[PDB]
Amino acid sequence: QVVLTLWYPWAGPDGDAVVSLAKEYSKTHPNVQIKAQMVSGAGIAAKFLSAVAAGNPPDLVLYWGQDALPGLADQGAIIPLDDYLKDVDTSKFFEAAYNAMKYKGKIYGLPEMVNVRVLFWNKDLFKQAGLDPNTPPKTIAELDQMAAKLTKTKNGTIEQMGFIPWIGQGVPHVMAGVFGTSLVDSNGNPILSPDKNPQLLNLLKWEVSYSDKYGAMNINKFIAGMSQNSSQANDPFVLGKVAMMISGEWQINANKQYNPKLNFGVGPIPQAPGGKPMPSLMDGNTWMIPKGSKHPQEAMDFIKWTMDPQRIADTADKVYNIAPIVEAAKIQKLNNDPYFKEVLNVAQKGSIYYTPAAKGMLSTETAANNAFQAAQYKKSTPEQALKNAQAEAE
Ligand SMILES: OC[C@H]1O[C@@H](O[C@H]2[C@H](O)[C@H](O)[C@H](O[C@H]3[C@H](O)[C@H](O)[C@@H](O)O[C@@H]3CO)O[C@@H]2CO)[C@@H](O)[C@@H](O)[C@@H]1O
Ligand SMILES: [Zn+2]
Ligand SMILES: [Zn+2]
Ligand SMILES: [Zn+2]
Ligand SMILES: [Zn+2]
Numbered sequence: 001q002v003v004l005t006l007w008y009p010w011a012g013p014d015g016d017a018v019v020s021l022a023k024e025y026s027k028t029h030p031n032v033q034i035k036a037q038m039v040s041g042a043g044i045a046a047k048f049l050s051a052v053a054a055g056n057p058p059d060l061v062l063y064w065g066q067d068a069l070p071g072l073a074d075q076g077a078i079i080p081l082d083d084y085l086k087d088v089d090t091s092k093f094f095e096a097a098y099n100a101m102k103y104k105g106k107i108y109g110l111p112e113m114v115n116v117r118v119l120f121w122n123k124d125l126f127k128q129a130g131l132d133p134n135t136p137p138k139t140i141a142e143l144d145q146m147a148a149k150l151t152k153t154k155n156g157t158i159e160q161m162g163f164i165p166w167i168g169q170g171v172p173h174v175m176a177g178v179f180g181t182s183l184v185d186s187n188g189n190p191i192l193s194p195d196k197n198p199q200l201l202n203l204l205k206w207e208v209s210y211s212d213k214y215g216a217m218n219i220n221k222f223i224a225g226m227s228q229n230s231s232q233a234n235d236p237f238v239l240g241k242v243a244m245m246i247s248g249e250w251q252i253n254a255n256k257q258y259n260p261k262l263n264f265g266v267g268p269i270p271q272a273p274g275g276k277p278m279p280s281l282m283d284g285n286t287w288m289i290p291k292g293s294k295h296p297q298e299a300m301d302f303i304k305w306t307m308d309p310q311r312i313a314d315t316a317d318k319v320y321n322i323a324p325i326v327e328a329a330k331i332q333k334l335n336n337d338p339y340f341k342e343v344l345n346v347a348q349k350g351s352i353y354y355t356p357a358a359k360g361m362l363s364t365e366t367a368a369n370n371a372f373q374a375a376q377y378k379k380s381t382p383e384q385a386l387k388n389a390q391a392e393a394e
Pocket of ligand 5: 029301302305
């Protein structure tokens with residue numbers, strides 16, 4: 001009778017896992033059929049507000065981060081969940097992941113998975129350059145040095161890249177914390193200009209050094225046709241074309257599924273000057289129920305079903321994420337996996353930081369992303385690009 005519409009933000013294995021959860025829920029709940037539709041970035045990432053405004057929204061969404069939540073809640077595009085949570089023991093969640101759900105006194109989402117950011121490196125290419133394959137770079141300067149050893153060009157044309165800073169999870173909203181800063185201040189206002197954020201300038205100048213060594217056009221010719229900031233069976237790490245890449249812990253899966261023989265290492269992101277050792281953003285996927293959801297109660301009951309310690313441990317194992325439920329992270333089979341053990345060591349030892357909470361986060365990110373790309377393409381200097389972004393953001 002009741003038909004639940006759910007949007008999830010990616011295809012591939014994570015997409016399938018979600019579709020399969022919906023399927024198996026609908027089998028044992030004859031009165032609640034779920035229809036799962038892939039909509040990229042859940043139509044939110046810097047279609048969701050279009051459909052809420054039209055009165056037509058899904059009954060439930062899965063977003064791939066935590067950054068959009070304040071903005072959606074401040075506009076009342078998503079509903080507060082307090083009234084549906086008095087029978088849920090929310091202390092079973094990891095505290096940070098749950099803490100991310102609160103905005104001006106109310107809960108507006110539930111964490112679906114936990115994620116970390118890490119450095120991957122290709123052990124075969126390391127051995128080829130005479131580099132110890134279990135010795136990742138610890139600082140950015142070590143990284144830059146290693147990346148020069150691992151880069152092979154023939155008269156300008158690139159045959160092998162050691163490192164590209166802006167691919168994978170090398171994006172401004174992740175990397176700013178690595179350089180020990182943020183895109184917004186404590187009040188949630190944009191801090192993108194050199195004057196307001198000297199560490200951000202340092203980050204961009206670091207990035208632009210790569211496009212000055214190798215040529216922005218050479219780099220872009222080299223990765224033509226490859227996925228850049230979504231990690232797929234066609235990103236340049238998986239293809240064996242970049243020696244090192246910053247990505248999320250899920251990349252373990254994308255590596256294994258594209259090529260099982262690719263010998264790779266996973267470890268902490270290199271420390272940046274002005275930043276902390278082993279820096280890592282910890283975030284996660286989040287469930288939200290939009291203003292206009294026709295069956296919020298059924299939506300919450302699927303979500304609840306979803307969180308069951310064994311089930312969600314099986315899910316986190318399939319997609320290589322961290323289960324947001326304390327007890328389920330402990331039962332995950334991935335706990336024996338050598339690669340996932342290194343990921344866990346990062347969440348344990350690294351200097352963790354979290355997605356900042358600002359109502360204008362997404363537009364600031366857009367201004368920031370545009371300024372990075374402009375200075376990567378020598379259209380403006382880093383100082384000017386960041387000045388212009390500040391104007392764009394305000
Ligand atoms: O691939 C499954 C894996 O995805 C994780 O979410 C990531 C997405 O897949 C994308 O890689 C996404 O990239 C976007 C950034 O968020 C920025 O908005 C901007 O750079 O645009 C890019 C391109 O879309 O990043 C998210 C992580 O924030 C995550 O859901 C994980 O659970 C899952 O296994
Ligand atoms: Zn598939
Ligand atoms: Zn963000
Ligand atoms: Zn209902
Ligand atoms: Zn039920």
